[PDB]
């Protein structure tokens, strides 16, 4: 985990550096973004709409590939920093009102190119673990499509090691395919902050245009 | 204040265990068995 | 009488050519008249997996020379000093980390992105700048 | 190492870390740079981490006189322990080339307008002032450029010794001068009664086994000199000796196949399906006293002075042989008996001690059907792993090394050894889902001795496994071979510099690490380059917690530190709560002094440094230091007291000793922690 | 279930050395164990719940008894054999030698009405320390024994009509 | 849980009208119900398990008592309010009027050792018909009462040491 870039060969450490290289794409997933497999293609959300939109945290931060330079938050107590410029957490509802009222927040992100869903990538800057509250929180990754309701995928817990959490789309081949259009992410804890959602598809074939 | 606030046993700043454990489990911590000493660190 | 078993397959796993079906049971009274296998009559997925208007952005520098705004008019948009870039995408497939600038491309008579060079937002002065003083910003 | 920054304009303090735990005994040229956009940290000339969040100057010029610069600590007493050699502060940011130039020129630097301060400690009071309540640190003599060639080679991610390095094992492969014929002396321990009539292994078994051993190694330049030692003791001979049977599971009700015998009571009745010969399952001294019946018949008490089962380590403790001049072979009957006893690796602390050797089965030693299973136990005693160590002995598929490809630093650490699973049948095994990363293995080494195959299909060693055999007989087993040829230089000399007329070259020390002539009956095997004696703990003692004057003898806290994971709790360390019986609640240590460990050193010397490998600490402590106190003993009885020190899980504690004018033959480590795990100690003279 | 090993002897020891000997914290830590020695925490809670009905002598006796029981429980839990009969023996022995040296019979003679009506059926049938307290209070005073057996009879009529109907009169 | 509606009355009625009144089939059907009237099937099985220890008079009493109880359970289960106290009342009344009319005291005076040594302390406490049989049986003879109280004291020494140590002597 070093690289030397001179004729007298001065060297530097490239894992914690903020610049991605050509060789670093297959090795450091934490600096060059999510590593797409060779048989698939990732597409990130566009025209993402949120629920508790405010002046402090707007809803256009989900657009595009997020910065992977943001480290995981271990038992984060406060979110008064400049985290909303590169992420999104609910700001209208604070800690005690969310803890007592037990409300719900959602992120209804749209997409641009209608393709099938092979996996759903959700990249978060934190696991939502509180300094006092040690109880784990579980989020739900729904999925929306054109001219139909949904195709549910289940629920998942947050892991710091898997910050770009991947949801395998469960689908039976006896059922006909569907063109995924939007992704809805719902969570009830206020400390869940989403940096960006994605959608994995096939760059080889599209199974909707043929099975008309 | 007549009995010297029970030797400071009702106030957290004057107990070696740094806790208040009143003789009746039924007494509220902000009522009869509360730290009402102004000389403690509560004020 | 025919029992249909939906084949579960995760789309992250690549497809495979199923060749044989094993049916195993312990009750002696099972009688099977025929077993089938459902496939796609259309495709084999193993061999497959072997004029835009002029755009103006405030507080920026449109240093691009797309003279003809046809399908493929590549332009570059960069904000000025003290201004950060906001992107609201419309139609796109892949993204690239351009940096402080961005590339906006023409597609079907509309631009693929909506960029906006919003000014940077300084914090409201409460503490940490002047000790024991009152701050009254008349502008913003 | 970390470098934190928070300017007056900014709102968030940001830290920059390093990429590795710091070395507690190496000189580090730490360099912190900040230009205005990116702050960078250089550890020993290489850029480790750079952050670009801080912008602008660090303070306004109006508050210039208010900022202060502190060295070695802070106002909240964040004190530093170590040496500071050449202080330097610049008024401008220097790039990496200037950092290496200031490294290579040391402190002999001229005056520059960018050079704010360049302090070499010849007059501290001219530019620095101590605290008015504190005292100035002491000035000593040290050299940062003491070595211009690093003589230390790091072992790989799943290696253990010096010869597991990539460039040292290859020198024993290409060259042929390191594979000369070598004679290794070894012994066979034969137990007899007090009348010289019944052996543990017959003489024809030893005669057949010696010729079969010399037949399989004569093609690899290895010869074995056999010296059979016979010990006559009817107390040891009549009783059962077991090797793989642990002593804790005898008292535990959990069953285990290693302890299942009529002379063990079938794990004390904890393995039989039914849960005097049958009423002895754990008669309170009625069946163990010799006046009633024989002790070896129906006594299975774990705390009895005389019992039927005997562990091999207690047999080695009773015999107390010499392992520095011979290889000791013992015998033990075991219920499992699929393999022999657990051999001692050369990188263990028991490589040359009396508790080390090869434990075999006496009913298979010398038999024509199981002759080769001693040879495999030779290969475990000579530094060779199993061939399936990179596949079968993998606890998790996210391991640091897993032999999916032949390499010199993965799995078996031999390129000729193909990856293979755990197989018993000869030839290439069938496919399965047991392997985590492969399905089809071709050219599996079934002919090698390291597989679990039978006697017929094991014939020869791979030529990449003879380099390790000829390496460990020079590294660890130098005292075994009677040849007076010293250990050779295992690495080629490196060219340091040259000019138009001369070229300067340096080479490594020889591979065994000895810097002096190997003279027996002296301390010359522990001296270092520069008349420095470095020694470990020879004798260790600790009081019993459940007894008033017990004083049990710990064993794992004596030798060199051997822990695979330096923060996970292990069994090769000394613990206050490990001294109790497994069926007894461990008591808390006393308040004003705590439980202590008394270590004793073999050679009493005037000490210069003391290093203690504290392995595991509890997550929370009452006092700030886990080790409460350290008392250096003396030959004159003056206990030199030292206060608490903050230990870390990974980095060993190191203490520099000033003004100790008396020789110290041992130390005492007083602690209050229940689960503190001391592994070793070292007294650098 | 004969070993206390199933509940780690490390976490309950940490709970014992972390808490204080004044309140019921030691008995709060001690109740979750492998052997079924539950009931000391109930005694500590019920003695400190109805302390207003006792006089100054009774309150001083309650304070000294809980102080001695907490101190002895933190003291002699250091080195002991890990088996449930030994745990029952040491708990009953510390309870007996703590109640005998602080004049439990004097507190029985002073205010008997509170101390004989505080026992609850189904909370003493399955709890050994409740049984130890009941028989020690029974041997303390004859009229205390009569009142506590009247309470036992009222509770038998409340809960289990077997031993009321069977051998109401002994001989 | 106060109503017998949790378990359908139709299936237990079909079970009652399908089985015969000679064996324990009626008590096999009735033992699984919403109200806890469990214990009649155990009496029917244990009386037909230790029937060899009795004489001809005792065996005739066993046959007549089981026949009367089965005929009464098939007879008066027709019109009855569906609640657990009413079911307990009618079960206890039919058991009492069946055991009183067939000379239970005569069979007790014939052979009392079998009738007081074959009882079990386990499941006696939680089964109401067992308590009914015990508290009806001891009113026959004083020696039978002494024997069953001796059995209860032996079972106290076997199972529950509370009432042995507390009020062993009455006054
Ligand atoms: Zn082996």
Residue numbers in the entry:
A (entry chain B): 900 to 1111
B (entry chain A): 1494 to 1536
C (entry chain A): 1062 to 1111, 1134 to 1223
D (entry chain B): 90 to 364, 378 to 384, 389 to 791
E (entry chain C), F (entry chain G): 42 to 212
What did the published study say regarding this structure?
Originally discovered in the circulation of pregnant women as a protein secreted by placental trophoblasts, the metalloprotease pregnancy-associated plasma protein A (PAPP-A) is also widely expressed by many other tissues. It cleaves insulin-like growth factor-binding proteins (IGFBPs) to increase the bioavailability of IGFs and plays essential roles in multiple growth-promoting processes. While the vast majority of the circulatory PAPP-A in pregnancy is proteolytically inactive due to covalent inhibition by proform of eosinophil major basic protein (proMBP), the activity of PAPP-A can also be covalently inhibited by another less characterized modulator, stanniocalcin-2 (STC2). Here we present two cryo-EM structures of endogenous purified PAPP-A in complex with either proMBP or STC2. Both modulators form 2:2 heterotetramer with PAPP-A and establish extensive interactions with multiple domains of PAPP-A that are distal to the catalytic cleft.
Next, we recombinantly overexpressed PAPP-A in suspended HEK293F cells to biochemically study the enzymatic properties of PAPP-A. The conserved core catalytic Glu483 residue was mutated to Alanine (E483A) to avoid auto-cleavage and serve as the loss-of-function control. After the proteins were purified to homogeneity, cryo-EM was applied and a final 3.8 Å-resolution half-density map was obtained using a similar strategy as for PAPP-A·proMBP. The map revealed an extra component in the structure, which was then identified to be the co-purified endogenous STC2. Unlike the two proMBP subunits that locate separately in the PAPP-A·proMBP complex, STC2 exits as a homodimer and also forms 2:2 heterotetramer with PAPP-A. Each STC2 contains nine α-helices and 14 cysteines, 12 of which form six pairs of intramolecular disulfide bonds and Cys211 residues from the two STC2 molecules form an intermolecular one to facilitate the dimerization. Besides, Cys120 links to Cys652 of PAPP-A and locates at the PAPP-A–STC2 interface. In contrast, the PD from PAPP-A·STC2 complex is only attached to the SD without interacting with any other domains. As a result, the relative orientation of the LGD, PD, and SD remains unchanged in the two complexes, forming a rigid core of PAPP-A; but the βBD, CCP, and CTD have drastic translational and rotational differences and thus constitute a movable region. In contrast, the dimeric STC2 efficiently induced the formation of a 2:2 heterotetramer with the C1130S variant of PAPP-A (lane 5). However, the STC2-contaminated PAPP-A only accounted for a small amount, and the majority appeared as apo PAPP-A dimer that is too dynamic for the high-resolution structure determination.
